[PDB]
Design a protein around this ligand. Structure first.
Ligand code: VDN
Ligand code: MG
Ligand code: ZN
Length: 323
């Protein structure tokens, strides 16, 4: 409708309000936003992806995100997808990626939490759940999001990559597995370290653009691009960030309550009777989100400064909410 088109004017912008597109699209923010991104970037025409097939697939994907999970639902997938879309347009990475690398990064963004049960890897491992027995305790959820994501391409009327060559499906697949497995938080300190090495030897050509020799370097930036996108919540406007914070904290406290009914040890932050939301956001930003984004800002100097300033204002806001 009208309100939806006005809200979509900010598609290429960090300030887009995905909460508002969710309301104007009959709660189909992922289908909605992915259709917009794919059209704007001409991915449908480029890869001969039928509009019909694409909607069918995105709708089914969207239905695999549980709407009863407070944070990890299709709204979150849509926010990560749209943030990734904005990140691929950083001036510093202009014309560096192939359309296939762009296709892969946004496709990964969309599936990266599909069928999330609302609990963490450590909870699934500690409760001997079926998926942890299946995946041998390694990146249990991430491996599953990928399995579910790719399993839905196995029906002609849903195969969005049908018209790619065999070579492009093989490459796109490698890239997506690699990007989604990189959203596993237990790999954060390893990724951030390799990204700080990427920055130290970073090269920028005469045109103000980064030089990525070959595939190893390009996929490194892409793994990090989607990792930051997945942790982009405290870098948005204080109004969006407070809503995201209330969601994630609802999920975490829900997990602590499950942990409590079983007699398991409750992690100091999922413990609703004690945990200070405010203090845990400030520790989240200081020890994890700011180091990641400060490093991303260095790689893309100066395109991510506005994002760093917002981060430091949101942290400062949250810090002022504790006596
Ligand atoms: C206090 C909530 C902090 C918070 N706010 C936001 C917006 C987010 C967010 O997007 N993602 C993360 C987030 C943070 C961690 S963690 O490293 O901080 N950590 C969680 C707590 N446990 C058990 C005690 C140890 C590991 C793990 C997973 C997370 O979700 C990302 C998929 N946390 N987060
Ligand atoms: Mg995840
Ligand atoms: Zn996520």
């Amino acid at each position: 409708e009208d309100h939806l088109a006005k809200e979509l004017e900010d598609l290429n912008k960090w300030g887009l309000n995905i909460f508002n597109v969710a309301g104007y699209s009959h709660n189909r923010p992922l289908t909605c936003i992915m259709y917009a991104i794919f059209q704007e970037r001409d991915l449908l025409k480029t890869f001969r992806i039928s509009s019909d097939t694409f909607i069918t697939y995105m709708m089914t994907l969207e239905d695999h995100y549980h709407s009863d999970v407070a944070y990890h639902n299709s709204l979150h997938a849509a926010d990560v997808a749209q943030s990734t879309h904005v990140l691929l347009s950083t001036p510093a990475l202009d014309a560096v990626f192939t359309d296939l690398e762009i296709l892969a990064a946004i496709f990964a963004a969309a599936i990266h939490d599909v069928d999330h049960p609302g609990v963490s890897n450590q909870f699934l491992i500690n409760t001997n759940s079926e998926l942890a027995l299946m995946y041998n305790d390694e990146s249990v959820l991430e491996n599953h999001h990928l399995a579910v994501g790719f399993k839905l391409l196995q029906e002609e009327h849903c195969d969005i990559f049908m018209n790619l060559t065999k070579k492009q499906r093989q490459t796109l697949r490698k890239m997506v597995i690699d990007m989604v497995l990189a959203t596993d938080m237990s790999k954060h300190m390893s990724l951030l370290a390799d990204l700080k090495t990427m920055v130290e030897t970073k090269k920028v050509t005469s045109s103000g653009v980064l030089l990525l020799d070959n595939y190893t370097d390009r996929i490194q930036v892409l793994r990090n691009m989607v990792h930051c996108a997945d942790l982009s919540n405290p870098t948005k406007s204080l109004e969006l960030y407070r809503q995201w914070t209330d969601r994630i904290m609802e999920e975490f406290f829900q997990q602590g309550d499950k942990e409590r009914e079983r007699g398991m040890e409750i992690s100091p932050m999922c413990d609703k009777h004690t945990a200070s939301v405010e203090k845990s956001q400030v520790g989240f930003i200081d020890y994890i989100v700011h180091p990641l984004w400060e490093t991303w800002a260095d790689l893309v100097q100066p395109d991510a400064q506005d994002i760093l300033d917002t981060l430091e204002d949101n942290r400062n806001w949250y810090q002022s909410m504790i006596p």
